[PDB]
Amino acid sequence: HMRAMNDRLPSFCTPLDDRWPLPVALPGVQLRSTRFDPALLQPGDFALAGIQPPANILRAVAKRQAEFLAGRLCARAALFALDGRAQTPAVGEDRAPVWPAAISGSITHGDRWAAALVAARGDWRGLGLDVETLLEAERARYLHGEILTEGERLRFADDLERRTGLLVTLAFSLKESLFKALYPLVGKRFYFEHAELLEWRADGQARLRLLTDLSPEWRHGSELDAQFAVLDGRLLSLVAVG
Ligand SMILES: CC(C)(COP(=O)(O)OP(=O)(O)OC[C@H]1O[C@@H](n2cnc3c(N)ncnc32)[C@H](O)[C@@H]1OP(=O)(O)O)[C@@H](O)C(=O)NCCC(=O)NCCS
Numbered sequence: 001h002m003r004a005m006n007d008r009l010p011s012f013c014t015p016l017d018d019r020w021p022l023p024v025a026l027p028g029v030q031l032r033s034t035r036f037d038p039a040l041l042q043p044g045d046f047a048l049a050g051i052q053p054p055a056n057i058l059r060a061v062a063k064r065q066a067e068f069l070a071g072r073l074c075a076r077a078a079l080f081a082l083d084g085r086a087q088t089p090a091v092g093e094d095r096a097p098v099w100p101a102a103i104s105g106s107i108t109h110g111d112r113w114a115a116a117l118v119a120a121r122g123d124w125r126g127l128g129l130d131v132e133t134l135l136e137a138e139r140a141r142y143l144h145g146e147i148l149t150e151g152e153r154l155r156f157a158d159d160l161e162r163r164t165g166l167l168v169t170l171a172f173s174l175k176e177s178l179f180k181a182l183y184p185l186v187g188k189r190f191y192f193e194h195a196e197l198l199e200w201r202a203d204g205q206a207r208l209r210l211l212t213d214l215s216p217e218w219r220h221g222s223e224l225d226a227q228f229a230v231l232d233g234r235l236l237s238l239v240a241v242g
Helices: 045-049 062-083 137-147 150-155 157-162 164-186
Strands: 029-035 103-109 113-120 126-133 195-200 205-210 223-231 234-241
Touching: 029 062, 045 062, 062 103, 062 113, 103 164, 113 126, 113 234, 126 164, 137 164, 150 157, 150 195, 157 164, 164 195, 164 205, 164 223, 164 234
Parallel strands: 103 126
Antiparallel strands: 029 113, 103 113, 126 234, 195 205, 205 223, 223 234
């Protein structure tokens, strides 16, 4: 189809990568990712990619424009791959993406790295993806009180002293993914205190526990398995709800 191939990638992004960056694969998901540089962004890249930006992103700063667009390219390519639709999710009033009917996905973008994954809602009701740069030990010791609950600081006291940046970065990433997976289901807003990390292993497997009631099904003590990958000085984590 001739016009859907008029949406070539703007030069500030590397080609959309389909390689799975996580330990365990998930059936029925499509994840695309890119490395971008907000400096290479051109004043006509949005029309080039065929992605209509909302009024907010038109007058935003260059770093935000690049992150939004790069995340929207990955989303459209992931969605195209799953079912063939070159559609971009709108921006909700609650800042969340507005995925098409019977589609659940997630978008993340950090320092020069972006990705998005999508799935049919009949396979995965909720999806939360989040990448975070590895915190330095100092800044991690400064943020450990906000991110880690006192039960987590005790449970992972060893890593808290030895591998400070890894543990805090991870709970940061896992808890943000958990939020992005459950929010389009529960509607409520919960924060770093409302979940705890329970176990994490080098093979990339993790497990979370809810600390408050979010819905009849998502009650206090409900647990969700997650996975994570630590490569390239950044940590990427995934929470998927069947
Ligand atoms: C959504 C949130 C977690 C992302 O913060 P971030 O990880 O620094 O930003 P990321 O780039 O990694 O993810 C950004 C994307 O999240 C998506 N997003 C925003 N709000 C969302 C929501 N309520 N539900 C699902 N996805 C959401 C958006 O698509 C955004 O990309 P866009 O704005 O370019 O479209 C953050 O805005 C937030 O609300 N943090 C507090 C909530 C939290 O941490 N709870 C812990 C629960 S244990």
